Design an enzyme around this catalytic site. Sequence first.
Site, PDB file in Angstrom:
ATOM      1  N   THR A 292      -7.557  10.132   5.576  1.00 16.08           N
ATOM      2  CA  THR A 292      -8.382  10.476   4.423  1.00 16.08           C
ATOM      3  C   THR A 292      -9.593   9.561   4.285  1.00 16.08           C
ATOM      4  O   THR A 292     -10.200   9.503   3.210  1.00 16.08           O
ATOM      5  CB  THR A 292      -7.548  10.439   3.139  1.00 16.08           C
ATOM      6  OG1 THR A 292      -6.714   9.272   3.144  1.00 16.08           O
ATOM      7  CG2 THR A 292      -6.681  11.685   3.026  1.00 16.08           C
TER       8      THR A 292
ATOM      9  N   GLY B  37       0.801  -1.207   0.000  1.00 15.20           N
ATOM     10  CA  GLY B  37       0.000   0.000   0.000  1.00 15.20           C
ATOM     11  C   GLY B  37       0.839   1.265   0.000  1.00 15.20           C
ATOM     12  O   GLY B  37       2.068   1.245   0.099  1.00 15.20           O
ATOM     13  N   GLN B  38       0.142   2.401  -0.099  1.00 16.03           N
ATOM     14  CA  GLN B  38       0.827   3.688  -0.203  1.00 16.03           C
ATOM     15  C   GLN B  38       1.734   3.943   1.001  1.00 16.03           C
ATOM     16  O   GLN B  38       2.907   4.300   0.845  1.00 16.03           O
ATOM     17  CB  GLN B  38      -0.190   4.817  -0.354  1.00 16.03           C
ATOM     18  CG  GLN B  38       0.459   6.190  -0.387  1.00 16.03           C
ATOM     19  CD  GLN B  38      -0.547   7.310  -0.517  1.00 16.03           C
ATOM     20  OE1 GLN B  38      -0.581   8.225   0.305  1.00 16.03           O
ATOM     21  NE2 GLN B  38      -1.370   7.247  -1.557  1.00 16.03           N
TER      22      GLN B  38
ATOM     23  N   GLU C 139     -11.417   3.983   8.542  1.00 15.92           N
ATOM     24  CA  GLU C 139     -10.143   3.398   8.951  1.00 15.92           C
ATOM     25  C   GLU C 139     -10.221   2.631  10.273  1.00 15.92           C
ATOM     26  O   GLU C 139      -9.492   1.631  10.415  1.00 15.92           O
ATOM     27  CB  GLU C 139      -9.081   4.501   9.005  1.00 15.92           C
ATOM     28  CG  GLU C 139      -8.750   5.051   7.625  1.00 15.92           C
ATOM     29  CD  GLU C 139      -7.504   5.906   7.618  1.00 15.92           C
ATOM     30  OE1 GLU C 139      -7.514   6.961   6.951  1.00 15.92           O
ATOM     31  OE2 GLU C 139      -6.516   5.523   8.276  1.00 15.92           O
TER      32      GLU C 139
ATOM     33  N   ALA D 153      -8.108  -0.392  -3.475  1.00 19.84           N
ATOM     34  CA  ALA D 153      -9.147  -0.997  -2.653  1.00 19.84           C
ATOM     35  C   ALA D 153     -10.135   0.021  -2.102  1.00 19.84           C
ATOM     36  O   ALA D 153     -10.996  -0.348  -1.298  1.00 19.84           O
ATOM     37  CB  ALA D 153      -8.516  -1.781  -1.500  1.00 19.84           C
TER      38      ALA D 153
ATOM     39  N   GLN E 226       5.761   4.179   0.490  1.00 16.13           N
ATOM     40  CA  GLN E 226       6.437   5.452   0.703  1.00 16.13           C
ATOM     41  C   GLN E 226       7.385   5.374   1.893  1.00 16.13           C
ATOM     42  O   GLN E 226       8.512   5.879   1.826  1.00 16.13           O
ATOM     43  CB  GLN E 226       5.407   6.573   0.872  1.00 16.13           C
ATOM     44  CG  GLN E 226       4.597   6.821  -0.405  1.00 16.13           C
ATOM     45  CD  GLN E 226       3.724   8.072  -0.367  1.00 16.13           C
ATOM     46  OE1 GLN E 226       3.357   8.603  -1.413  1.00 16.13           O
ATOM     47  NE2 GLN E 226       3.378   8.535   0.832  1.00 16.13           N
TER      48      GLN E 226
ATOM     49  N   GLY F 196      -7.171   0.379   2.397  1.00 15.62           N
ATOM     50  CA  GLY F 196      -7.779  -0.872   1.973  1.00 15.62           C
ATOM     51  C   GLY F 196      -6.764  -1.920   1.557  1.00 15.62           C
ATOM     52  O   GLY F 196      -6.969  -3.117   1.788  1.00 15.62           O
ATOM     53  N   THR F 197      -5.665  -1.496   0.933  1.00 15.68           N
ATOM     54  CA  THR F 197      -4.583  -2.417   0.613  1.00 15.68           C
ATOM     55  C   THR F 197      -3.751  -2.727   1.851  1.00 15.68           C
ATOM     56  O   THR F 197      -3.546  -3.897   2.193  1.00 15.68           O
ATOM     57  CB  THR F 197      -3.700  -1.827  -0.486  1.00 15.68           C
ATOM     58  OG1 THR F 197      -4.502  -1.540  -1.640  1.00 15.68           O
ATOM     59  CG2 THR F 197      -2.597  -2.804  -0.861  1.00 15.68           C
TER      60      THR F 197
ATOM     61  N   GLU G  36      15.323 -13.392  17.782  1.00 15.55           N
ATOM     62  CA  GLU G  36      15.700 -12.731  19.025  1.00 15.55           C
ATOM     63  C   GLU G  36      14.756 -11.583  19.357  1.00 15.55           C
ATOM     64  O   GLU G  36      14.596 -11.232  20.533  1.00 15.55           O
ATOM     65  CB  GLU G  36      17.145 -12.240  18.925  1.00 15.55           C
ATOM     66  CG  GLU G  36      17.813 -11.983  20.263  1.00 15.55           C
ATOM     67  CD  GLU G  36      19.328 -11.976  20.165  1.00 15.55           C
ATOM     68  OE1 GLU G  36      19.854 -12.344  19.089  1.00 15.55           O
ATOM     69  OE2 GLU G  36      19.986 -11.603  21.166  1.00 15.55           O
TER      70      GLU G  36
HETATM   71  N1  LIG Z   1       3.206   7.946   7.950  1.00 15.99           N
HETATM   72  C1  LIG Z   1       2.635   7.788   6.759  1.00 15.99           C
HETATM   73  N2  LIG Z   1       1.298   7.462   6.679  1.00 15.99           N
HETATM   74  C2  LIG Z   1       0.706   7.295   5.478  1.00 15.99           C
HETATM   75  C3  LIG Z   1       1.432   7.452   4.306  1.00 15.99           C
HETATM   76  N3  LIG Z   1       0.590   7.229   3.274  1.00 15.99           N
HETATM   77  C4  LIG Z   1      -0.637   6.940   3.765  1.00 15.99           C
HETATM   78  N4  LIG Z   1      -0.582   6.989   5.131  1.00 15.99           N
HETATM   79  C5  LIG Z   1      -1.676   6.711   6.076  1.00 15.99           C
HETATM   80  O1  LIG Z   1      -2.299   5.504   5.669  1.00 15.99           O
HETATM   81  C6  LIG Z   1      -3.700   5.581   5.838  1.00 15.99           C
HETATM   82  C7  LIG Z   1      -4.365   5.344   4.490  1.00 15.99           C
HETATM   83  O2  LIG Z   1      -3.937   4.108   3.967  1.00 15.99           O
HETATM   84  P1  LIG Z   1      -3.083   3.993   2.608  1.00 15.99           P
HETATM   85  O3  LIG Z   1      -1.791   3.233   2.807  1.00 15.99           O
HETATM   86  O4  LIG Z   1      -2.812   5.363   2.040  1.00 15.99           O
HETATM   87  O5  LIG Z   1      -4.093   3.191   1.638  1.00 15.99           O
HETATM   88  P2  LIG Z   1      -3.610   1.936   0.757  1.00 15.99           P
HETATM   89  O6  LIG Z   1      -2.807   0.953   1.575  1.00 15.99           O
HETATM   90  O7  LIG Z   1      -2.822   2.438  -0.429  1.00 15.99           O
HETATM   91  O8  LIG Z   1      -4.950   1.178   0.274  1.00 15.99           O
HETATM   92  P3  LIG Z   1      -5.975   1.747  -0.838  1.00 15.99           P
HETATM   93  O9  LIG Z   1      -5.493   3.077  -1.361  1.00 15.99           O
HETATM   94  O10 LIG Z   1      -7.334   1.892  -0.193  1.00 15.99           O
HETATM   95  O11 LIG Z   1      -6.066   0.744  -1.962  1.00 15.99           O
HETATM   96  C8  LIG Z   1      -4.004   6.964   6.381  1.00 15.99           C
HETATM   97  O12 LIG Z   1      -4.135   6.873   7.782  1.00 15.99           O
HETATM   98  C9  LIG Z   1      -2.768   7.763   6.041  1.00 15.99           C
HETATM   99  O13 LIG Z   1      -2.563   8.782   6.987  1.00 15.99           O
HETATM  100  C10 LIG Z   1       2.782   7.780   4.374  1.00 15.99           C
HETATM  101  O14 LIG Z   1       3.442   7.921   3.345  1.00 15.99           O
HETATM  102  N5  LIG Z   1       3.377   7.948   5.609  1.00 15.99           N
HETATM  103 MG   LIG Z   2      -3.689   3.436  -2.228  1.00 14.56          MG
END
Ligand SMILES: Nc1nc2c(ncn2[C@@H]2O[C@H](COP(=O)(O)OP(=O)(O)OP(=O)(O)O)[C@@H](O)[C@H]2O)c(=O)[nH]1
Ligand SMILES: [Mg+2]
Lengths: 348, 54, 425, 438
Positions: D179, D10-11, D183, D99, D15, D144-145, D254
């Site tokens: 967003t 996921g994002q 959640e 997702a 990242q 969602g992912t 460990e």
């Molecule tokens: N610390 C941090 N939190 C992140 C980042 N990207 C998204 N989030 C957090 O992750 C949550 C949203 O989930 P995402 O990971 O963006 O969604 P996804 O896993 O890509 O799944 P879908 O987009 O629904 O298919 C929110 O609470 C965001 O604040 C990031 O780069 N750094």
């Molecule tokens: Mg995403």
Amino acid sequence: MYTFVVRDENSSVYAEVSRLLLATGQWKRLRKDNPRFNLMLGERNRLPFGRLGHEPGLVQLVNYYRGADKLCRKASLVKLIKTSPELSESCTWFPESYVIYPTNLTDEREVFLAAYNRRREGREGNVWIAKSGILISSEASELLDFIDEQGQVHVIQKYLEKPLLLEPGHRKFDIRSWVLVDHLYNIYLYREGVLRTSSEPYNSANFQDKTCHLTNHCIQKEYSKNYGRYEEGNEMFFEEFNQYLMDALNTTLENSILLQIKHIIRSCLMCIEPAISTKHLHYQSFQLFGFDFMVDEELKVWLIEVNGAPACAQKLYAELCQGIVDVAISSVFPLAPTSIFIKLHHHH
Amino acid sequence: MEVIELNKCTSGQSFEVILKPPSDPSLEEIQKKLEAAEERRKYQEAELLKHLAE
Amino acid sequence: MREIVHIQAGQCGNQIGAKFWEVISDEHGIDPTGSYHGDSDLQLERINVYYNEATGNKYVPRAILVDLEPGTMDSVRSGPFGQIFRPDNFVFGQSGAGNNWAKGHYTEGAELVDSVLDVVRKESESCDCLQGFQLTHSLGGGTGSGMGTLLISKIREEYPDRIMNTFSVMPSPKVSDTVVEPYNATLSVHQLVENTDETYCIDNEALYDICFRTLKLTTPTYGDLNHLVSATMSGVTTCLRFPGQLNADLRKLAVNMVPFPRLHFFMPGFAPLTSRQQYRALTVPELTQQMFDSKNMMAACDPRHGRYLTVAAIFRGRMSMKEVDEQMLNVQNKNSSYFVEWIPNNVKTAVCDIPPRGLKMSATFIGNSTAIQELFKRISEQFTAMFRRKAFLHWYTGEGMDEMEFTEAESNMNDLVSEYQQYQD
Amino acid sequence: MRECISIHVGQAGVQIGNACWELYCLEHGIQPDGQMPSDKTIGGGDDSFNTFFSETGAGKHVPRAVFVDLEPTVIDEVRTGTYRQLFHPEQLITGKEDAANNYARGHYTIGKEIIDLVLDRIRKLADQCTGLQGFLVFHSFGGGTGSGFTSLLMERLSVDYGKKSKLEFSIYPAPQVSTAVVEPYNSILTTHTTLEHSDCAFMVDNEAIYDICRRNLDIERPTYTNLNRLISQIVSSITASLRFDGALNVDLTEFQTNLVPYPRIHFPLATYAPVISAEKAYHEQLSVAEITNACFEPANQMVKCDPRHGKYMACCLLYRGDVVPKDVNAAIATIKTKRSIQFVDWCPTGFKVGINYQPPTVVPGGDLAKVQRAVCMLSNTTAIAEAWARLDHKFDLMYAKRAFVHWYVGEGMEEGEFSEAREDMAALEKDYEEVGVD
Ligand SMILES: Nc1nc2c(ncn2[C@@H]2O[C@H](COP(=O)(O)OP(=O)(O)OP(=O)(O)O)[C@@H](O)[C@H]2O)c(=O)[nH]1
Ligand SMILES: [Mg+2]
Ligand SMILES: Nc1ncnc2c1ncn2[C@@H]1O[C@H](COP(=O)(O)OP(=O)(O)CP(=O)(O)O)[C@@H](O)[C@H]1O
Ligand SMILES: Nc1nc2c(ncn2[C@@H]2O[C@H](COP(=O)(O)OP(=O)(O)O)[C@@H](O)[C@H]2O)c(=O)[nH]1
Ligand SMILES: CCC(=O)Nc1ccc(S(N)(=O)=O)cc1
Ligand SMILES: [Ca+2]
Ligand SMILES: [Ca+2]
Ligand SMILES: [Ca+2]
Ligand SMILES: [Mg+2]
Ligand SMILES: [Mg+2]
């Protein structure tokens, strides 16, 4: 516009604070489950501290210190005093106490009997009191058998056989002090205390009838036959009591008693400050405490217990509750004297 | 305040200080769950098409 | 490459749809001939969501123009940006619909719907990954209302797992063409309850009141009303057209705004709305205070009469994102009685750096409020005032409809009202 | 030497993964092209850094990492980013549509159709390993992912790699950057199905990283880049023992032995200090006692909670820079006599200490200032249960009305999975209470 919730409908104190807050026109009350609040007047037991300070943009404040129960519990207070080096087991202003678990459940049974057998052999006064439903007796067999019949933790402490007796009447009494601790952990002592007096003559040869030995406002008003004789509601305030100490004992309330009370309050609250302070916390706490003291015929003050959710004398609700709004609530949430409190300075 | 198991090397060291002593689903079961949800989705879409056919 | 297919049907639908493409074409740097002449890469970042790219670097909107008479679409083709639309995407008949829902849905519309679906299928077969559809139409007429909802029914059958989105203009007796508009609106609302995931409710009464009282337009025209719709359509689609993460997706928007499948009717809002004192700078507090005021709302419903299930705010322009969060949190923390407490953090805020044309900054408001039931109540009462005397029904029974179908639409919309009422307490 | 495979889902996972491998490279002297001048064994070797990097004949050091996302925009940054040359295309997997913040959509609808592909790509990495330890899985709770697909991947990993350890780096949801309203649903659904498959999980609450960035780094409105640069410093501190010579936390096993005596309670609290603003004129360098003492301040915990009102089950001190054991023990003694540190009665009251002499590496142009010494404390406190309570409460609020439940049922998930997952959390909160409170 500041917002607050009320999660304790039985608190006579914050019922008045809630009334005062709304009277300012700058505070709005929300449902008890609305998380977007600045101030929580929280429940007594199981207050959800863990859900405070997680609302973006809201400075949240609660009227209870998480962890203060260590001080406001019978067994907890005993454990705290005996184990905290700040108070030490040789603490000179706390009656000799012992934590006694009923035999149907650490425990200080044998430790108590050792000190008890020592007094019995030394011809000294060996009268103890058990509480957690209270029993006063001079025989250790009766005290222990009383706790085993119950099912909760109890404490046995030495009974003050030489209390200071008011005259006329030859009667016992206790002193209630209200102490307010703000979010910065400043210790404020309300200038007004109440003596909850017994309307019955103190009789040292009969601990069975507990009307002249227990100064609780509800006991004197239910099992005493001289209630309200010498003072209205068995509540002598500092002005009268001070004038008494001068006429009879040639001293003042400040010198003979108040210094010891201020010293005890400091020692207790400073002791637990590192454990309950909200200085670096995501939310802020403040709490009102009711300290109960005993005075013996030597003008030495003993601490009896501390109350975490105290009530107030009817005559002192207005002044004290307004003080709670000034120093505890408006200090963090200001509005668009001659303080009624006495600040007890200390090293944080 | 004891120090035990002190290990040292060129890039650091590590040790332990003791202050006080003390007092699944199979591959088949996962496919069923996945295929069960896929079947419930197919059923709902069939009702939606049946509704649209009416 | 998350493409959206746009469909505009009927007079109102094609006139508002035309202005919409006019506005966002300017925001993306697309001139009337489809050539790009912008100066920011953000303009092209998500351009393919609404535009197809043809030879010579030409951008052609992914839009389909539908009507049962030629008149309005001849105007579009001759309008300002008329030349930018794909010629093959003009699908129209000659009969007209005479403001008759049955003609657009059952008789005249049925004869034309298949050819419209042939263009839709053509646009979708060229999408890398189609998101869904957005339809602009009114509910008070015949084509946009009757044939519009017919198109939605047949699109959902061929693309059952794609998101269906609509901008729906609700009729009002203050800005009315015919007395049968409540009949047509009640019949369409039932279709929308079933076959759309998101519907932006646009009440012509609110648009009128805003033009008269707020904008100080003495004699408002349909053109004036369509200026407000343009700006609103641009605001609610910013999340889809520019780089971002809040919403920025038809399905993700639905998941955050629709807690219950049938309650998917939104109140949109925009700020500023200034009368020509138009050069003054607008602060963040001002943008927020207005964006939440009912006088800036385009559903003609008093929000203080209901409760917000979910809210989506979008701020456009170079501003203090810190100062945005503060004012937003101030509105929620100063009126928490109008937000349901069983949906934590139900107010989401998005920022966009590119402001609309001729404005340093603006704010668009999307609310899923239970007060919207006032809109359906008005329509229901106007429907019943006539239906109880079977007034004007012969226009519809003459097209093969039965009175029973009217009774069902009546009950279906009163159920919808009752559904909003239970969540308001 | 035993290898570790990192998985970013996921994002948030991707990242954060990008920021970690950026940091790993700077720490091990690896350039964007994969070259490592200090590696005198060309095309192979079993050094400590080889647990995270493989080597090609040409001398390229390739992360043992997989990036998975159901949408291509986030992973496209990796393909054309500064470190585009580190990874080959097999390592980056992207779908066409995400997702939609819907757990059921990531776990079932979309997960079923891509899971076998991800496993195949992981199998390729595993086949280069001569003694694979396990996996480090980065993901969010709220996506969602990150939520839905991760739990599916963990189930299969426990099947395809039975005896392999699995650690998590999970992003706890925070409204200031969240967003999606659902959640809480996703977080609780993914914890339920992952609980029995994760040997140790490090939760990072975005609220905490957000407030640290504004308080210590003077960033009025932190971005994901700001958040991720800080998170990768903590992550680096936790994985350093696997990438450098040492004797503490030398393998993934460990981590469980030292931090998790009870299996379900496998969520250690992370605390990091110091975090100093780079834009600062010039800070006074803190001592060992001052940074150690800071480990018991709520302000620098990865999850805001009050350890004073919990009980410790384990405690690791991970130092980086100019630190000697003499100074650590001195500070610890001073902290014991001042702090409220209560251990569960069935666990020793001690501290496992690890010291790496190389101070923290700061990313050029980053926000963090170079410090001479830093520490990350890993403590398993019952106090972190405050986070479960917060989350379970928001869950209860929405689920009482079935708000948004139709989105999950519509993707083939049964409604009963909501209550099943919630009951598991209620049992998890009860476990903490039974260990922490008297
Ligand atoms: N610390 C941090 N939190 C992140 C980042 N990207 C998204 N989030 C957090 O992750 C949550 C949203 O989930 P995402 O990971 O963006 O969604 P996804 O896993 O890509 O799944 P879908 O987009 O629904 O298919 C929110 O609470 C965001 O604040 C990031 O780069 N750094
Ligand atoms: Mg995403
Ligand atoms: N060690 C002791 N020596 C003498 N008297 C004692 C005593 N401990 C308690 N008492 C008597 O008991 C009374 C206080 O009882 P205690 O405070 O323990 O019960 P309680 O807590 O239910 C009343 P409250 O909490 O309202 O002050 C006092 O009036 C005092 O006279
Ligand atoms: N806001 C707006 N409303 C319109 C416009 N044209 C028509 N309407 C409204 O739409 C309804 C009539 O529907 P119309 O689009 O003309 O019928 P159709 O061509 O058969 O779909 C009435 O309620 C009108 O008030 C327009 O340009 N703007
Ligand atoms: C629902 C309204 C409607 O159908 N009006 C309408 C239709 C046809 C004609 S006529 N007489 O055939 O020209 C006149 C009016
Ligand atoms: Ca015909
Ligand atoms: Ca090598
Ligand atoms: Ca396993
Ligand atoms: Mg009491
Ligand atoms: Mg018309």
